[PDB]
């Protein structure tokens, strides 16, 4: 190939009875003709091929008032629309282009809407009917710098719109392109106008080569081709829906008349892009005519082929024309044609041509070695189709395009609430179509996650199985720094982390080799297999604490590395007391082995402490219970400040008896707790200097977070945390947890999640001021996990879901674009 | 420089008070404004830069009906008498387009007259209102095939057709190109758009970076640019009038609101296109400024130049803007901008920007290092300037372009006795005018030769200066096989020869090479030099017959030479008498040598023969000659049959002067000859022998023309030709020249020219039956000579005119264009 090659990234349109690329699949295969008489509500020849409506937009989505709107040309419209459709079906995010190089080139040959305006003036009418902002309003919408144009050579526009985009793309001007056209139909007054001239067939059909041919029906829509170079598209892993390998435009010179196509013309612009190709005759698999069904310039057409890519072939050539299902779009005919080519070279089948029974008799098919297709058959051999533009002034345009070389969640978002609810619809219904179901849920996850602008309104829908996701979905249809809190004892439950293992990879990893460790340190000293002790539900051994303390150890930091993994990277870290092991170890203050020693240690020295230790949950005040145990400091003290309205009472189960009793005779809510000692009482004296000794011999960073003491209630500094007193003090003194979520929202904390297992810590969290529980209790752990991050990312978290799909080999695939909230606008 | 630099070969221009442009460099120079009040045959923004009209076209010249022209758009009009004056100014002929790959790109942006159409059908309207056809309809008139596309980019449209046009050429996609725009402001509709919008000037001025700017006032009219590489233009010697080093195209991305210029764009914009030429903010002598004199717009576009052109460079950056001349043309504000600093280019002066005396505020031109053009300077230190152009929705343009690296016939013709005379008459005024007293007589003669189409309608006018060509003109705006007959004894005369060799080297060398042979022939055997003879008017020798036939051959043969070297080629050749010997020679019967050798030898033979001899011219026919003559045949017979009613009687002057008395006698014209001897008679029988002894001495080669025998009076083949029986006889019998005459046309002659000197046998050829005298008499022979190549060419004989100025050293200079025959077109 002569020049760089051009990629085909992506395409929309708006076509008559297709209102994407799928419908017109539908269309063309089906053989199916979208020629209607003229819709009552347009005006008045009385047939063509019509949009269901053209007085519809979402202009809000666009940022565009109801004023501009009514003002503004349909066509510029629709090409908006087109713009971004095009781009969401190459899977590129529209934000990643503002500020580059995005050229923009539409062939408009026709202001409908500018006439009826003018035949009946305020600000919006310069903008809104200059052709010119066909083109720069989308590059003024995208931020796009490239060269953005509209080109009229009649009946060529949309085609020489593409080529102009190739060669802008082959010298490096633009490193993007939007090219195709747009023509609307909506004004009598232009009706009249190419009626007058005579060209249009009285049988309102493009008899395209059939001896019917009596001229041509009318057609309204837009066409979009996403272009990048073949070498840029490959290199940054795009969706390649097929490659043009040459572009060319010529003018027939001294034809009979202006408007009669030359043979010599058309033959020297074939032969031209094709040698600058290098595809013989035999390579081209099939060509979209212009084919309009005129009597003087289907035989032109023919001839012109005839003598190019007949000559030097076996088989005859198939041909056919989009104009026999849509009518003539004039100035956006080119991009219909080559949006049907680009089709046929994905689905690697060919259509029908409609309209065709009897061949022309100033066409010899079986000399010019040209069949036309007539049969929706596969296509035989990479595969490779001309197109053919031709204007009435004589600008002719011929493209030659090359086919290509556990639990999921689904992301939705929206500019609306109304917008969600519909674009939740729009993926429910795809994802049950047949079209829907040549992709894996797997890989509409990642598409989802990566190839969709992320708008102010998400929702994550969670399933295992295509059919749990749609349901989601039609059921859908009807903030500050992030701090973490790691859970403490009392949060543990048996099974801890066994559903969580098998789901995610990266906590199973990172599970594996904390509890390698701590199998290692607790079989040396034990109070051999951490996990088996976990994963069972057969099991109590947890409620004792030289299993409890390493538990949650172990299931904290296999959570936390799979949330830093999606994108959940705290900032400011605490725990409520052994959670606050987990927090420096995360924050990097001690290694694993040094933090698996410490918890490990911790849990021993306090388990081999005598029983006679409780702990009970009181609705009180810290002066109500600072009041009642004032004396006693000997035997009994307070365990935890947990709200303002919630403290634990820890010491000598006799002297928690008696204040359970109080409180209950306070009628307060008093809960025993299900613990094995009293905890952060003066119970725990005996292990302190034996503790002391273990934490002497670790060594303690300054951390990478935030942390927050639940012995301070503060933001506590490293020279403080880096010391053996510290953590001394940590096992004996009270939680002061409350203070700590203080301390945290002080710091600028607006979002809370419970790092753990159930949700202790966030109801504390709740009580004392956005808090989600990062696993909460009577669901699946995926499940209730997913939910969480889930609401973290609706509240507006850049949680990273391209990372939870790393797991997978997941590939980009095509999507529904996005779901327009269209109104009415128009003059009167 | 990056890319091919491309070559500005030519231009053209209608725009306000500025018809071409001459006018607008007087306009600028004169720092004069065309903003006038809005004319009163144009409709209502009560101010503007008008044409004198738009109404007025030559649809005729360009084979266009009333009925289409009155359908046609006045853009559409504009834009072909443009491409006309486009290709004239470059000085290239038309005709020598058709066929190639010339490209057509325009920016318009405005359908006016589309407008006023569908406010109040016939087949015309569709092509008449289509804007596609202001290109399409250029490429069709002179038969192009290169891209012909219209580009709509607002008030950009123009100088991104520049930009598209140089791509074009760079990627040989196109050899040549015509770029430039169009806006014709001829709807009120349109003015109203524009107003409501607010951006016009209340005081209908552009105050370009003064204070005073407060908006834009509208222009009208269009420009062309003719495009060629520099490497093309060079190698084909074309007149370089500057050349386009970089053009760049880029949009602002996220303006502010959609039509606010962005400062950052156009910086990019021009940082890429200056180092894409690879000069720095020093090089750069002058930039054409957008200047439209807005509020917002002024800043940003001072602020852009100041960061990228302004910083880097001692002196300040001269700016001015046309705007401030003629009005925002809009669409045609980029081609309006450029062709001004093409203009100061050529000529090496800056010219003022109007309505400058205080500063914008909000531009300072110190700290930017801009200074705005107030006067007509020259331009110092090759020369480059920048040209901007931005489009409300956001597409700017930029290109950088640097200044280029005796007796006379002059040719005019047009379409129309008409037009020939408005031709003659421009072509008068323009000479007188001080831009054509910069072109000398001669190159302006090669000019109107090689750079001009030859209409169907021409004349030719001599001249020795000026004054005489120029009075020449205003006095004028008051075929077959070309035949050559070469003169014989009679039409010979004292001077002979010498008024054309001192005016024509071509004769003089090759009358030096013939008198050369016939002094060594004459020397050796004498009736010594034939020059000296011939040329001195105090001579009679001529009359006298060995003198006669050497000096007849002579003359005869650089006359032909001379007529040969002009492409005055003749196909068929006979001779009276001596006449036949240079008709054979430059038929290529013989060499130089052997006719030299056969003239000499014949002149002499006979010329020493004895008197007794006389010749008398008769009117009356062969018959009656022969009737009265039978029965004397050793004494007298016919000499010559000239016409039906002209016959020579030679022999005995006593049977002479009986035969002069009879006729006489009869009431009939007898004129006694001037001769030595009675030629062709029985007289000559004793010179005969020894004639044939000298022919037979000589080599006779087939002739490359058709030559007609005075002997045979019928074409003569070689055969009978090359024979020594031919040449005594041909010596001795009647000289059967009107028989001749009669074989000339019956063989295709349609053009007779007299080759030697006076017109007898132009007289007897008029007898016979277009006929024209190479050197009638009583003028000098320069004069007659022109003057009878005149008719030839004017008849419609291809004259090779550049071959008459080979002799001098004639350079192609700029031109009047066609004095186009307008009338009125339009609706009603």
């Known amino acids: 190939a002569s020049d760089e090659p051009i990629a085909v990234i992506g395409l929309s349109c708006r076509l008559p009875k297709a209102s994407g690329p799928q419908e017109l699949w539908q269309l063309l295969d089906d053989g199916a003709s979208a020629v209607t008489r003229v819709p009552a509500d347009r005006e008045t020849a009385r047939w063509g091929g019509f949009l269901d409506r053209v007085d519809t937009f979402d202009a809000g989505f666009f940022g565009i008032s109801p004023r501009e709107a009514a003002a503004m040309d349909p066509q510029q419209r629709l090409v908006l629309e087109l713009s971004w459709e095009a781009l969401e079906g190459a899977g590129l995010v529209p ?13 408009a040959a026709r202001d409908d809407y500018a006439t009826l305006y003018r035949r009946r003036v305020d600000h919006h009418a310069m903008t809104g009917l ?29 085609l020489v719109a593409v080529h102009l985009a ?55 829509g837009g066409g979009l081709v996403v272009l990048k170079t073949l070498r840029r598209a490959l290199a940054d892993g795009d969706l390649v829906h097929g490659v043009i390998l040459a572009s060319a435009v010529n003018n027939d010179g001294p034809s009979d008349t202006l408007t009669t196509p030359s043979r010599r013309a058309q033959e020297s612009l074939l032969t031209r892009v ?16 212009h084919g309009t069904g005129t009597k003087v310039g289907d035989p032109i057409e023919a001839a012109a082929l005839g003598a190019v890519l007949g000559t030097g072939r076996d088989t005859p050539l198939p041909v056919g024309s989009i104009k026999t299902n849509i009518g003539h779009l004039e100035g956006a005919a080119g991009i219909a044609g080559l949006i049907k080519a680009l089709l ?22 079986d000399a010019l070695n040209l069949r036309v297709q007539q049969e929706s058959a596969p296509w035989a051999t990479t595969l490779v189709a001309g197109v053919s533009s031709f204007g009435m002034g004589g600008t002719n345009c011929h493209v030659v395009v090359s086919a290509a070389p556990a639990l999921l969640p689904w992301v939705v978002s929206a500019r609306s609430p109304q917008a969600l609810r519909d674009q939740a619809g729009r993926l429910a219904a795809w994802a049950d179509s047949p079209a829907g179901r040549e992709a894996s849920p797997v890989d509409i996850g990642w598409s989802l996650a990566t190839s969709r602008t992320h708008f102010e309104y998400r929702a994550v829908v969670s399933g295992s199985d295509r059919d749990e996701l749609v349901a989601s979905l039609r059921a859908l249809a009807s903030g500050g720094r992030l701090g973490l809190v790691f859970s403490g004892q009392g949060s543990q439950r048996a099974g801890m982390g066994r559903e969580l293992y098998v789901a995610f990879p990266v906590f199973a990893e990172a599970f594996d080799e904390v509890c390698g460790v701590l199998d290692e340190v607790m079989g040396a000293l034990p109070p051999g297999s951490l ?18 303390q390493p538990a949650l150890f172990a299931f904290e930091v296999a959570l936390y590395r799979l949330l830093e993994s999606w994108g959940v990277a705290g900032e400011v870290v605490a725990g409520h007391s052994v959670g606050e092991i987990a927090a420096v170890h995360v924050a990097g203050v001690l290694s694993l082995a040094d933090a698996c020693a410490l918890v490990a240690a911790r849990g021993r020295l306090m388990q081999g402490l005598p029983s006679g230790g409780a702990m009970v949950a009181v609705e009180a005040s810290e002066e109500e219970v600072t009041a009642l145990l004032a004396g006693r400091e000997g035997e009994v003290g307070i365990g935890a400040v947990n709200g303002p309205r919630s403290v634990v009472v820890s010491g000598g189960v006799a002297v928690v008896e ?61 020279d403080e945390l880096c010391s053996v007193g510290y953590w001394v003090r940590h096992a004996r003194e009270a939680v002061r947890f409350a ?17 753990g297992p159930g949700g202790v810590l966030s109801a504390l969290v709740r009580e004392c001021l956005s808090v989600v529980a990062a696993v909460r209790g009577n669901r699946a752990e995926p499940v209730a996990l997913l939910s969480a991050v889930g609401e973290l990312f609706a509240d507006g978290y850049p949680v990273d879901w391209t990372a939870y799909f790393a797991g997978w080999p997941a590939a980009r695939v095509e999507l529904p674009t996005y779901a327009f909230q269209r109104s009415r606008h128009w003059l009167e």
């Open 95 to 107: 934000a990643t282009l503002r500020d580059t190089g995005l050229g923009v080139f539409v062939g």
């Open 658 to 718: 008696e204040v359970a009793a109080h409180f209950a005779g306070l009628g307060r809510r008093a809960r025993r707790l299900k613990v094995s000692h009293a905890f952060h009482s003066p119970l725990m004296d005996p292990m302190l200097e034996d503790f002391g000794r273990v934490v002497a011999g670790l060594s303690f960073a300054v951390p990478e977070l935030t942390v927050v003491s639940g012995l301070t209630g503060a933001v506590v500094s490293a």
């Open 739 to 755: 203070d700590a979520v203080g301390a945290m929202a002080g710091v600028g904390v607006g979002r809370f999640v419970e790092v």
């Open 166 to 220: 190739c060669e802008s793309l082959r010298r490096g001007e633009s490193d993007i392109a939007l090219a195709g056209g747009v023509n609307l139909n909506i004004a009598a007054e232009s009706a009249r106008e190419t009626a007058a001239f005579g060209g249009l067939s009285p049988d309102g059909q493009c008899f395209t080569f059939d001896a019917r041919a009596n001229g041509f029906v009318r057609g309204e």
């Open 130 to 158: 200059h052709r010119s902002l066909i083109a720069n309003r989308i590059s003024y919408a995208l931020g796009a710098h490239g060269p953005s144009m509209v080109v009229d050579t009649g009946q060529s526009s949309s």
């Open 531 to 548: 996990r088996e002790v976990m994963f069972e539900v057969s099991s109590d051994l947890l409620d004792e604490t030289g299993f409890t």
């Open 344 to 365: 046929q070279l994905r689905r690697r089948r060919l259509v029908p041509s409609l309209n065709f029974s009897t061949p022309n008799p100033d066409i010899p098919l």
């Open 274 to 289: 094709y040698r600058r190709a290098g595809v013989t005759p035999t390579e081209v698999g099939y060509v979209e005519l």
